[PDB]
């Protein structure tokens, strides 16, 4: 039933007695459900050190991964170019998923096409799909560039992207001069960030490989910035903002900031802003190239060093105090621009916030996950805050990266009780927050299910989730945030200390039981 003046959605509708009784009868009559005592016993068991050992002995099964597949990253990379259509050569199912995934994180349109390879193309290859697809796409959506990647079907059958595009131009499906950079992006190698790396390297090569002879390093007096796979608008913005306040000439290569944040003013804009073809063509003339997320930009680096002859500085991601400092000093060295009074003051304001909030941050234990550069920057900043990053999980991390993170941990007393996990997933992490319980998790929306699990053992075992990373689907507009620079660190610090205080308020809200410690002032 419904009361028309206060209508119930699923929650709390199905808590009505007639629905509860109905559901009990469904269960009892037809579900042949394990007895509740057995369900309890098995749950309890899944929280133990014994289960955790069995769990970490897995070799074949993956449960609740914390990574996605390459072409997702290729698409995000491509969106960052002016009037550019991401194009995934392969099966269309993939593109519905790519688009929906990003739709839900950014709450924005995400344009991407497929060339719809089907069973016919599975033995003959997708050459005809490429011809018709490029022609149809260019005619219908009017991009000025089509950036081509692949699904795992096209990869397995061995479609030669280069040959297919070359033949597409040769037979008149698209103009010879129309830009079609490409990259092979297999599902089964690396992760989404690898796809970003591959696509970017493909685009850079497309615009610079054949014209290196009139290039002179430093001749345009700018610094190139390659952001990598980035899903916080605030991070593109903050990097551009700091460089501008320093008076540094720059070119941000792959810049989806505008197209991921168009106004609702009565028209839909399929394309907006983005790195220009001009910028890519001119990029070798920069003083140098700075990689914001070097641990998934290795191929790009190989090309920039080898072909553009830029001496890519050895910088960590500009996250936290020390690494933002280092990024700024390196930028100053390269450009010859001094660090301005404004950034010095911003830095000091961050330090001030640290002094203000250190007593609540001290010794707090975190489980956390995400992509490698993001993860190591989060770790570094936590150590700077006097926090303990006890469970550090990076599903798509590698052994070299793990060595780097272990060295970071060793350089601080706050790293004593920390372990770095690569190749492990959120079912592994679930076990860790049961057996060696932290105070909080820092992670994406999939963490909510771990929080649920822990509360199920008991309120005292609950590990609340702090949402930082990608994807965040169950809160609105967090994609507008910043995690880079002093600004990013200020936001992260604030989020952390106030999550701590929220939880403490919850634990002390009990009238005449715990509210002796429900302080007005903290």
């Amino acid at each position: 039933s419904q009361q028309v003046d206060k209508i119930k959605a699923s929650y709390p509708l199905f808590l009505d007695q007639d629905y509860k009784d109905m559901l009990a009868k469904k269960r009892d009559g037809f579900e042949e459900k394990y007895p509740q005592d057995k369900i309890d016993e098995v749950f309890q068991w899944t929280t133990t050190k014994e289960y955790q050992e069995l769990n970490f002995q897995r070799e074949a099964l993956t449960v609740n991964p914390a990574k996605a597949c390459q072409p997702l990253g290729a698409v995000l990379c491509a969106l960052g170019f002016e009037k550019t259509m991401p194009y995934v050569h392969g099966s269309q199912g993939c593109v519905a998923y790519f688009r929906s995934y990003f739709n839900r994180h950014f709450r924005e349109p995400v344009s991407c096409v497929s060339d719809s390879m089907t069973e016919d193309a599975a033995v003959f290859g997708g050459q005809q799909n490429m011809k018709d697809g490029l022609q149809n796409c260019k005619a219908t959506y009017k991009p000025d560039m089509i950036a081509v990647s692949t699904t795992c079907m096209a990869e397995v059958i061995g479609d030669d992207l280069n040959a297919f595009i070359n033949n597409s131009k040769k037979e008149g499906f698209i103009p010879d001069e129309f830009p079609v950079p490409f990259a092979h992006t297999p599902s089964f190698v690396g992760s989404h960030v690898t796809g970003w790396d591959n696509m970017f390297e493909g685009i850079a090569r497309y615009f610079t490989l054949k014209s290196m002879d009139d290039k002179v390093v430093g001749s345009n007096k700018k610094i190139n910035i390659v952001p990598g796979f980035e899903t916080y608008l605030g991070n593109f913005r903050v990097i551009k903002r700091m460089l501008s306040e320093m008076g540094v000439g720059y070119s941000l290569l792959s810049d989806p900031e505008e197209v991921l944040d168009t106004p609702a003013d009565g028209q839909f804009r399929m394309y907006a802003g983005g790195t220009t073809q001009e910028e890519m063509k001119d990029a070798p003339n920069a003083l140098n190239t700075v990689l914001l997320q070097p641990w998934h930009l290795e191929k790009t680096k190989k090309f920039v060093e080898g072909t553009w002859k830029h001496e890519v500085p050895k910088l960590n991601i500009p996250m936290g105090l020390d690494w933002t400092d280092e990024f700024l000093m390196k930028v100053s060295e390269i450009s010859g621009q001094p660090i301005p009074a404004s950034l010095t003051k911003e830095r000091g304001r961050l330090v001030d916030m640290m002094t203000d909030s250190h007593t609540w941050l001290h010794g707090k234990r975190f489980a956390l996950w995400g992509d490698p550069d993001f993860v190591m920057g989060l770790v570094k900043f936590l150590l700077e805050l006097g926090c303990e990053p006890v469970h550090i999980l990076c599903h798509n991390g590698n052994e070299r990266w793990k060595k780097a993170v272990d060295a970071i941990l060793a350089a601080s007393p706050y790293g004593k009780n920390a372990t770095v996990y690569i190749g492990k997933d959120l079912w592994h992490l679930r076990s860790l927050v049961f057996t060696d319980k932290p105070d909080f998790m820092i992670g994406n929306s999939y963490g909510k299910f771990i929080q649920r699990d822990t509360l199920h053992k008991g309120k005292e075992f609950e590990v609340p989730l702090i949402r930082i990373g990608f994807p965040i689907f169950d809160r609105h507009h967090l994609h507008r945030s910043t995690t880079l620079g002093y600004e990013g660190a200020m936001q992260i610090l604030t989020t952390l200390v106030n999550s701590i205080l929220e939880r403490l308020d919850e634990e002390t809200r009990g009238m005449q039981a715990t509210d002796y410690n429900h302080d007005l002032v903290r």
């Binding site: 419904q2 028309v4 959605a9 699923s10 509708l13 007639d18 629905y19 109905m22 469904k26 037809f30 579900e31 042949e32 459900k33 749950f43 899944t46 289960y51 070799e59 099964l61 993956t62 449960v63 609740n64 991964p65 194009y87 099966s91 269309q92 199912g93 993939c94 519905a96 998923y97 929906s100 739709n103 839900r104 349109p109 995400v110 991407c112 096409v113 497929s114 060339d115 719809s116 390879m117 069973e119 018709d132 697809g133 796409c137 260019k138 219908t140 795992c152 079907m153 397995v156 089964f188 190698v189 168009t262 106004p263 609702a264 003013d265 009565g266 839909f268 679930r430 999939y446 299910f449």
Partner: protein, 477 residues
């Protein structure tokens, strides 16, 4: 718009295409004639999508794993292949269930074999067998396993059927191999069909020789309701208030045992025709169980359906039928009284999957609204056959609409409301057009049944009449 104006619109929009695409797409766009019974005369469907035109369609894995198998709550479904498909489809569909997730239920979890290149080059059958052992160790209360094939499985020649038979015998466990590779078929639809056949071949006959089930004359199954936001629960309640016994729900909140008990029922009640007509037909041919189509969207359709279902039984169910209708009459009348005047006359365009673009028209009309355009991602012509009678004269119909087409159609027709999917939503909101997700219900619902109708109405009103839509143009221009 007149018929002629719609035809002119269609040709205008078709002008941008290369000639091959134009000639294909012309066959997939039509102006409704409500007199037409046979749709093949005016529209074509279930064909390959044109390359590069941004179809809204998904794949067969989406149809098998995402749609049909995924909701079965006490089984574990393996997304078999590389890591992408299972991750993007993890908990994207709100197929609701009661259970203890990770212990006896597994729906919102993502199990995957996470193929690396070595699995591609050497095959994944050994990894799959090892995976199944790890599944048994770490999830002992699971009541069966499905293997949802992703694109590479068939392309590299793995034999998941052999693995399923052998590990199934070894562990005495139902392990179901499903060949729903994304390259098969042209859309989610073939995934439905493959999935239906997999249920048929590996699950449905298990209790063929078991006579321990206590049956009654009023046993039914709900076939093809995936319980989006509780839709199936707000349907079930009515069927049982009417005196029927719902032995099974396929597959929202569904258990493997109710699937296995479904051949013992007296009648199959089919909501989603598209996705489960295959197994409904099989159950008629093999067990002699009749099936009938019904519609629980809005009071007109729900009342009609309850009466039609009740007529298949005796006087006692018919009596109970009228008692249910009388019970809910003041409730849905109150909803209509509150919201129809606020929605009267407003015009809606829909674009959804294989059932709702026709099945929800009645609910809209119950709020005095008019559906002026509709279309499906992957319906077949028997669907459009069922659609043209439900739509007004001169209305616009589109099969596998392209992004470009949909945007241009909306620009000309100017609906007051659009009902479609997540990939469409933010596009049309930016145009100043109220949007409701008619797959996910925009995280609201249920919309089925009388209780669902109240929520449907509330939702259409809250959005169509929201203050935000008056604010898109800056007062200074």
């Amino acid at each position: 718009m007149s018929r002629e104006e719609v035809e002119s619109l269609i040709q205008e929009v078709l002008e941008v295409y290369p000639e091959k695409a134009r000639k294909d797409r012309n066959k997939h766009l039509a102006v409704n004639d409500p007199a037409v019974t046979q749709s093949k005369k005016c529209i074509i469907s279930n064909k390959k999508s044109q390359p590069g035109l941004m179809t809204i369609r998904g794949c067969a894995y989406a149809g098998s794993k995402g749609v049909v198998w995924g909701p079965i709550k006490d089984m574990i479904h393996i997304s078999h292949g590389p890591v992408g498909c299972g991750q993007y489809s993890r908990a994207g569909r709100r197929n609701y269930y009661i259970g203890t997730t990770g212990v006896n239920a597994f729906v919102t979890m993502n199990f995957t074999s996470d193929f690396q290149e070595k699995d591609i080059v050497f095959g994944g059958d050994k990894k799959l067998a090892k995976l199944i052992d790890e599944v048994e160790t770490l999830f002992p209360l699971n009541k069966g396993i499905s293997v949802q094939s992703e694109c590479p499985i068939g392309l590299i020649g793995d034999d998941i059927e052999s693995v399923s038979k052998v590990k199934g015998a070894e562990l005495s466990k139902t392990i179901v191999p499903v060949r729903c590779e994304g390259f098969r078929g042209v859309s989610q639809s073939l995934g439905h069909h493959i999935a239906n056949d997999a249920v048929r071949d590996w699950v449905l006959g298990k209790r063929d020789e078991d006579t321990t089930f206590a049956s009654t004359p009023y046993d039914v199954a709900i076939i093809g309701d995936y319980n989006i936001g509780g839709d199936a629960w707000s349907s079930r309640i009515l069927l049982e208030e009417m005196g029927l016994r719902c032995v099974a729900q396929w597959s929202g909140d569904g258990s493997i045992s109710e699937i296995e008990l479904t051949p013992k029922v007296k009648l199959n009640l089919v909501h989603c025709y598209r996705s489960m007509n295959y197994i409904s037909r099989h159950m008629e041919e093999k067990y002699g169980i009749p099936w009938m189509e019904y519609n629980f969207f809005g009071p007109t359709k729900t009342i009609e359906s309850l009466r039609a279902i009740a007529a298949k039984f005796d006087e006692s169910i018919q009596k109970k039928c009228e008692e249910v209708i009388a019970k809910y009459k003041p409730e849905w009348e109150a909803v209509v009284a509150k919201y129809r005047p606020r929605l009267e006359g407003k015009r809606v365009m829909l674009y959804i999957g294989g059932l709702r673009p026709r099945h929800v028209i009645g609910a809209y009309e119950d709020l005095g609204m008019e559906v002026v355009g509709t279309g499906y991602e992957f319906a077949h012509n028997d669907d459009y056959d069922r659609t043209m009678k439900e739509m007004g004269d001169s209305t616009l119909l589109y099969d596998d609409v392209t992004g470009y087409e949909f945007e241009e159609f909306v620009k000309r027709i100017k609906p007051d409301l659009i009902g479609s999917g997540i990939k469409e939503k933010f596009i049309f909101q930016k145009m100043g057009i109220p949007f409701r997700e008619m797959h996910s219900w925009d995280y609201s619902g249920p919309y089925h049944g009388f209780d669902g109708f109240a929520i449907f109405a509330r939702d259409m009103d809250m959005t169509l009449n929201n203050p935000c839509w008056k604010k898109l143009q800056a007062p200074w221009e």
